[PDB]
């Protein structure tokens, strides 16, 4: 169910994305607070999407990208991180860097489309 | 409380003169200082109201000034009908307090 | 929709959002475009806005409609110079208390500007056509700083030539999220504490030549203005009913003397002349520009209306507007104050402008003026100015005329050399 | 805090549409229940009588009733007022 | 404005005195009434002031217990009462409005402007 | 920044359009009025992103298609 | 006119969320931004 | 004398509310994130 792999190792909670996202959309004074409430709802998951496409992802839950990872965000194992840790923690450990991180790959997409450009392979 | 006091008692001075008295508060009463007019058979009345401004019917030879507590009182020309004994009391706070007058004879 | 921002005042509460320190702006390098602040619709919602802040912040305070009773008034008479002889008039009538079966015998000064004679007996002048309201005296309506903030989809461009007049192209232009903050002194014939040009004075009009149309002068110096309320006025207050208290002058100390504004006379010799050189640009170097009074109409019209301290004055500019030009001291002008005001131009909604107690002084800085032109023909081809009227959302039009809003449409198309891939 | 602000809305809102008690707030005439009463009880009820408005503008009419002394207060058979008319309004 | 005091009389010590005030030309609720004691010699002092609209009292210290204060809304006056005399007050008695402060939603507010409108004085002796 | 590129030449300006897009998504008479405005700005980013899907362009900054360019 | 404004309102941020459930539903699929998609689950003629 | 005195208090309604609500916590899901993996993109 819902958030069930959240004590769960990286690795393994990467297998319930799909549960998470389904979750997302599922008296005057009353009625202004609760239209407030939807049209935020709205509002958060449009940017999260937003960012993806921007990105080069859409329509996935999983998406590769040209960035290389870089040892001054986090140095660690493979292993470490998606056997031996959860998303909870990750989140944590590389809170710092998430803007950073955000940028490069605007700027990843950013080049990919300049070399889209050509009509020469570029080989 | 607040003390209050005045210092020229049983001043003297001719017609035409200038005349001043000065009065001193304990504490400080936020620059609120009143000055009254009594004179014997008589109901007092007030002269300045705050240590600057004049009551309403009360002639311009009347004016006033001072500090958080040295407070005067000046009469610009001295007339006959200012025989009084003259008191300065203090506005500002709640156990309001009159201090002793002082007497204003004709030289 | 805007939206305001900024840095117990209505205005604070209102634009509740907060402002960015250092905001930054775009600079556009190459684009022109066109502006009209005669067109301008930032101008028509600040107006409904600032009309909205007005009528909600009344909303909740003192009724006043118990008041509306028969009156008992004779003049004061007692230590009044002559400039105020008739002015004021000390009233009494029986009035309510907390208990519905209770009356008590009230006594106050009102201005005569606010209160009728009935066939003495006195009713106030609103009892014919509306209720009336008590503002809250606790409630600040004194202007602050406000920015207008666009949108998510929206621009706000800003023109920043030099010499713009509000209508045609710019070329230095910038994009802004907010504009600057505009403070929203209300205000008839001279305009308070807005911008100034930087160059020079800068006359702006829709159509220069047309007499129906009013002339915004932008002064590049401020004239500084000093009002007063020179008495010491003694507010009282009494009980309505359960929970409701209204406030009354009861007394005012010392000779009576009247209210008033000093401008220095030579600046405002010389910021007028510097006005003058600018209308010879428009209607020649070779004829005459007079300045005159108001035409006449209603008081809060003809006089120059302003808040100073929170009262409300009424003051006689025919001391300023009186000059021909042809190719130390200063300016006293007479005030009068009133407490029943309709406010923008509305009839009934009154309010009711509580005392304020001691005595009242404020400098203003007038960065602009509202004038007309007398009609005309040739003639003698001498044309004279008067102060104008004007509505209220001259008085915005006036900072807000170097802004636009602009909607942003991101999907276009044009021809290149690539096809679908497959 | 949102279940206290809710909370504090819920009744504001539902007392809206209530009767005002404005015409209540009259001065009152009351005397002590003396009928009837244990120890305990002496002086805690007090028989006040006034007039109180009708359907028509011009008519008055004269009610009795009872009220705990904790809501009536005394103005200086003596004359009493509520106890919240120099506070507020009183809506039923 | 006008003030009217009465009750000018000869008590014996051990007895109380009831003076009173009337006032006019002013609204009564909204101004306090002062009482100001003038000793034969000596100098002024003040006794106490009545809030008419809601009776609030206030008392020098000298009198606490001694004196009390009442109003009369409906007849516009004011009254102060000296409980037990002794010849030490024997004095002449004046009422005197303090011509500023109001009352508000958040309690009272004094503004600080003198004592007018004195009445003429009211002449009490305490002696056998 | 945004709009920067308002003054540059069509080719120029095409080299950043992801700053012109991450900008798109940034008293009861004022809260609806406020309201209202964040509909629409819902709305209409919606009512774009729709047209790209019907096109064949979904998920994309720059795309390419089979229309030919008319003279006219 | 409050109580009509609040009901567009509703209406309108309604209409906004079903698009975009279904919307989300093409994306879990691996069916978005099509109007036909193919898919790997066999029909059942139950 | 280590004596400690205890009273009847409360009058803030809010109090009372925290008696039911103290297990409760509410908190927002964020499904964006990024990980290290061998995988890039082609
Ligand atoms: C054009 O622009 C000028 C300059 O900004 C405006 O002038 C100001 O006007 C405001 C409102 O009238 C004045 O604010 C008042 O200040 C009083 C304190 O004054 C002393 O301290 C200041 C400290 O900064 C000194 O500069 C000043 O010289 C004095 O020494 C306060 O006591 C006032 O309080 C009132 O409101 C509060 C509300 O909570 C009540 O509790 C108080 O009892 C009282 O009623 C008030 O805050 C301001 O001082 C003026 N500035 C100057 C330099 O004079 C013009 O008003 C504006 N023109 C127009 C038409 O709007
Ligand atoms: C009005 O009343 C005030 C007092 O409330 C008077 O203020 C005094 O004025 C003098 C002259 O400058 C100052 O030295 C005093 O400090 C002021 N009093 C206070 C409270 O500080 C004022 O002069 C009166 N004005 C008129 C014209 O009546
Ligand atoms: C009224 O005009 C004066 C100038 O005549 C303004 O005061 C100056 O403001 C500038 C702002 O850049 C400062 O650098 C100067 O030092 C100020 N001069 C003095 C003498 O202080 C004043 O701010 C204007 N008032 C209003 C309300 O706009
Ligand atoms: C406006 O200017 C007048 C003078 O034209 C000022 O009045 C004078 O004030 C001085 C004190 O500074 C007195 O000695 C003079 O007797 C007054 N003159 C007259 C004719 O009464 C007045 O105070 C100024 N007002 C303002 C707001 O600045
Ligand atoms: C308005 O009032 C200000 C004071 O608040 C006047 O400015 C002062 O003028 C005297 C000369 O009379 C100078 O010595 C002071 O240095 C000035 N003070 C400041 C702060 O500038 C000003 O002149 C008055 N303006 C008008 C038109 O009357
Ligand atoms: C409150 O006062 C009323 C008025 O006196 C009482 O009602 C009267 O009771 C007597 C019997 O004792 C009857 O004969 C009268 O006809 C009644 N008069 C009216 C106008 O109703 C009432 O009983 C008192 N209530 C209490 C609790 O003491
Ligand atoms: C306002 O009007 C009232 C009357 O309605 C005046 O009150 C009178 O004042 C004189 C002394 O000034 C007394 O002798 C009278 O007995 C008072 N009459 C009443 C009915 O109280 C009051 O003085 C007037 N105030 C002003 C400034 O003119
Ligand atoms: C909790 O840790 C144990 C370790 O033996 C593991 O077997 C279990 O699956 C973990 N729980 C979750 C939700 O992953
Ligand atoms: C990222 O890698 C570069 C080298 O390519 C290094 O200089 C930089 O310090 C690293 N981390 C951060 C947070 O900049
Ligand atoms: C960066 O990491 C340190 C701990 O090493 C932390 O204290 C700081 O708040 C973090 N900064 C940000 C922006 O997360
Ligand atoms: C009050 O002023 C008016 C002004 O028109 C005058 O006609 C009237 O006689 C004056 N009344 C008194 C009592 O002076
Ligand atoms: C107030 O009521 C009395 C009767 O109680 C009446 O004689 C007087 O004229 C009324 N005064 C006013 C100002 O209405
Ligand atoms: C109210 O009375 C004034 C004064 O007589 C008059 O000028 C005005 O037209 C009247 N208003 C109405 C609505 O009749
Ligand atoms: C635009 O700004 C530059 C300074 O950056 C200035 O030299 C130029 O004259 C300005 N253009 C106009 C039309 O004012
Ligand atoms: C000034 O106004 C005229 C219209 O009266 C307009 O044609 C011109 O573009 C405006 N701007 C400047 C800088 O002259
Ligand atoms: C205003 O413009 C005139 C133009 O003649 C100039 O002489 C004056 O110095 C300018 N004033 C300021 C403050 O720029
Ligand atoms: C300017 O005003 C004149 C009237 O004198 C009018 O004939 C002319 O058409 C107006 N200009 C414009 C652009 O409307
Ligand atoms: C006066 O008007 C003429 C046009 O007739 C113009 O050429 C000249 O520059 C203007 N100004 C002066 C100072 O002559
Ligand atoms: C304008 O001035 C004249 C005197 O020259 C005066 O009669 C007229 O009433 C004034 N206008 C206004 C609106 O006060
Ligand atoms: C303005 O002052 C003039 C001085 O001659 C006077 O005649 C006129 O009536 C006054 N106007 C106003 C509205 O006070
Ligand atoms: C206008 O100026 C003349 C002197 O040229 C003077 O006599 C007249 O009174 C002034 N008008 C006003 C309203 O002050
Ligand atoms: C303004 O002052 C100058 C002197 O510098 C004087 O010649 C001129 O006549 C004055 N202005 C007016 C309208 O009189
Ligand atoms: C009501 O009880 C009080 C108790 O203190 C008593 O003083 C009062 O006289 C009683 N009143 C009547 C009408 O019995
Ligand atoms: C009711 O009103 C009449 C006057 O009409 C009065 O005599 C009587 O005392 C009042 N009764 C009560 C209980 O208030
Ligand atoms: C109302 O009357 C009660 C009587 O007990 C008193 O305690 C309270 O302070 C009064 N409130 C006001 C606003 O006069
Ligand atoms: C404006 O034109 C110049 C022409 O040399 C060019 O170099 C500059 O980049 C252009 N500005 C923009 C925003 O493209
Ligand atoms: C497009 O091209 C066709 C020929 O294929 C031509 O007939 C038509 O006029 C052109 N333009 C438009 C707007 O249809
Ligand atoms: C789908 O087919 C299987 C056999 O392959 C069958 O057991 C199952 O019941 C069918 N689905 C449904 C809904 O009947």
């Known amino acids: 169910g819902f958030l069930g792999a959240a004590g769960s190792t990286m690795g393994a909670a990467s297998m319930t994305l799909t549960v998470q996202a389904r979750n997302l959309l599922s008296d005057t004074h009353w009625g202004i607070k609760q239209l407030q409430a939807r049209v935020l709802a709205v509002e958060h998951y449009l940017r999260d999407q937003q960012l993806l496409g921007i990105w080069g992802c859409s329509g996935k839950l999983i998406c590769c990208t040209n960035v290389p990872w870089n040892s001054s965000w986090s140095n660690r194992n493979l292993s470490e991180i998606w056997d031996n840790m959860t998303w909870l923690q990750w989140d944590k450990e590389i809170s710092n860097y998430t803007q950073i991180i955000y940028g490069l790959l605007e700027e990843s997409q950013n080049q990919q489309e300049k070399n889209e450009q050509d009509l020469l392979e570029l080989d | 409380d607040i003390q209050m006091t005045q210092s020229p008692s049983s001043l003297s001075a001719s017609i035409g003169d200038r005349v001043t008295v000065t009065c001193r508060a304990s504490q400080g009463i936020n620059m609120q200082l009143c000055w009254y007019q009594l004179k014997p058979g008589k109901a007092p009345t007030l002269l300045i109201y705050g240590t600057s401004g004049l009551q309403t019917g009360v002639s311009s030879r009347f004016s006033g000034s001072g500090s958080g507590t040295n407070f005067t009182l000046t009469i610009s020309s001295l007339q006959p009908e200012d025989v009084a004994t003259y008191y300065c009391q203090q506005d500002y706070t709640t156990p309001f307090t009159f201090g002793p007058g002082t007497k204003l004879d004709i030289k | 929709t805007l939206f305001c921002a900024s840095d117990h005042n209505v205005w604070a509460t209102h634009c509740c959002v907060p402002t960015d320190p250092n905001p930054q702006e775009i600079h556009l390098e190459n684009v022109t475009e066109e502006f009209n602040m005669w067109k301008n619709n930032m101008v028509e919602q600040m107006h409904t806005d600032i009309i909205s802040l007005w009528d909600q912040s009344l909303k909740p305070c003192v009724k006043l409609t118990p008041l509306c009773v028969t009156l008992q008034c004779t003049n004061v008479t007692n230590n009044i110079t002559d400039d105020m002889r008739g002015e004021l008039k000390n009233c009494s009538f029986n009035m309510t208390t907390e208990l519905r079966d209770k009356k008590q015998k009230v006594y106050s000064l009102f201005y005569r500007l606010d209160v009728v004679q009935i066939n003495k007996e006195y009713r106030l002048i609103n009892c014919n056509t509306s209720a009336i309201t008590q503002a809250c005296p606790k409630v600040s309506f004194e202007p602050i700083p406000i920015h207008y903030c666009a949108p998510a989809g929206f621009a706000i461009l800003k023109c920043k030539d030099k010499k713009f007049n509000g209508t045609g192209p710019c070329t230095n232009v910038s994009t802004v999220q907010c504009t600057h903050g505009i403070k929203p002194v209300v205000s008839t014939q001279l305009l308070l504490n807005g911008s100034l040009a930087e160059e020079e004075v800068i006359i702006r009009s829709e159509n220069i030549t047309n007499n129906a149309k009013n002339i915004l002068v932008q002064l590049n110096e401020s004239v500084q203005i000093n009002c007063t309320r020179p008495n010491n006025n003694t507010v009282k207050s009494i009980r309505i009913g359960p929970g409701q208290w209204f406030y009354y002058t009861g007394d005012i100390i010392g000779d009576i003397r009247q209210a008033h504004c000093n401008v220095s006379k030579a600046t405002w010799n010389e910021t007028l002349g510097k006005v003058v050189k600018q209308l010879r640009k428009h209607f020649g170097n070779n004829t005459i520009i007079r300045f005159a009074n108001s035409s006449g109409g209603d008081l809060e019209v003809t006089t120059h209306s302003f808040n100073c301290g929170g009262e409300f004055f009424y003051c006689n500019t025919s001391g300023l507007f009186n000059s021909t030009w042809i190719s130390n001291d200063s300016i006293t002008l007479p005030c009068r104050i009133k407490q029943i005001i309709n406010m923008w131009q509305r009839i009934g909604q009154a309010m009711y402008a509580p005392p304020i107690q001691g005595v009242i002084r404020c400098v203003s800085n007038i960065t602009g003026l509202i004038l007309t032109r007398d009609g005309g023909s040739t003639n003698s081809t001498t044309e004279t100015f008067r102060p104008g009227g004007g509505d209220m959302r001259d008085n915005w039009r006036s900072e807000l005329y170097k802004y636009k809003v602009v909607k942003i449409e991101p999907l276009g198309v044009a021809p290149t050399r690539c096809k679908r891939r497959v | 805090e949102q279940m206290h602000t809710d909370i504090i809305s819920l009744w504001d809102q539902s007392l809206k549409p209530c009767v005002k008690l404005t015409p209540l707030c009259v001065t009152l005439q009351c005397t002590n229940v003396t009928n009837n009463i244990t120890d305990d009880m002496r002086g805690e009820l007090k028989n006040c009588s006034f007039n109180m408005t009708t359907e028509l503008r011009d008519k008055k009419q004269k009610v009795y009733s009872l009220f705990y002394r904790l809501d009536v207060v005394q103005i200086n058979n003596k004359e009493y007022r509520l106890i919240n008319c120099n506070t507020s309004a009183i809506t039923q | 404005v006008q003030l009217v005091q009465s009750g000018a009389e000869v008590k014996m010590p051990g007895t109380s005195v009831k003076l009173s005030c009337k006032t006019s030309?002013?609204?009564?609720?909204?101004?306090?009434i002062n009482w100001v004691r003038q000793a034969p010699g000596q100098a002024l002092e003040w006794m106490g002031w009545?809030?008419?609209?809601?009776?609030?009292?206030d008392y020098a210290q000298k009198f606490q217990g001694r004196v009390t204060m009442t109003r009369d809304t409906s007849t516009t006056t004011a009254y102060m009462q000296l409980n037990s005399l002794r010849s030490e007050d024997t004095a002449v008695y004046y009422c005197?409005?303090?011509?500023?402060?109001?009352?508000?939603?958040?309690?009272?507010?004094?503004?600080?402007?003198?004592?007018?409108?004195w009445g003429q004085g009211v002449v009490v002796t305490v002696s056998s | 920044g945004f709009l920067g590129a308002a003054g540059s030449t069509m080719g120029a300006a095409s080299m950043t359009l992801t700053v012109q897009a991450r900008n798109l998504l940034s008293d009861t008479h004022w809260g609806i009025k406020q309201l209202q405005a964040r509909v629409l700005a819902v709305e209409h980013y919606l009512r774009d992103q729709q047209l790209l899907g019907i096109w064949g362009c979904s998920g994309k900054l720059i795309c390419c298609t089979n229309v030919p360019w008319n003279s006219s | 006119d409050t109580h009509w404004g609040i009901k567009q309102l509703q209406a309108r941020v309604l209409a906004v969320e079903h698009y975009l459930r279904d919307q989300q539903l093409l994306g879990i699929w691996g069916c978005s931004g099509k109007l036909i998609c193919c898919t790997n689950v066999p029909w059942n003629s139950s | 004398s280590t004596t400690e005195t205890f009273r009847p208090g409360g009058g803030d309604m809010r109090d009372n509310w925290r008696s039911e609500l103290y297990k409760y916590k509410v908190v927002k899901i964020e499904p964006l994130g990024v990980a290290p993996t061998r995988c890039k993109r082609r």
């Open positions: 005197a409005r303090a011509r500023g402060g109001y009352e508000d939603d958040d309690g009272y507010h004094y503004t600080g402007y003198g004592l007018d409108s």
């Open positions: 009545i809030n008419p609209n809601n009776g609030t009292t």
């Open positions: 030309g002013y609204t009564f609720t909204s101004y306090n």
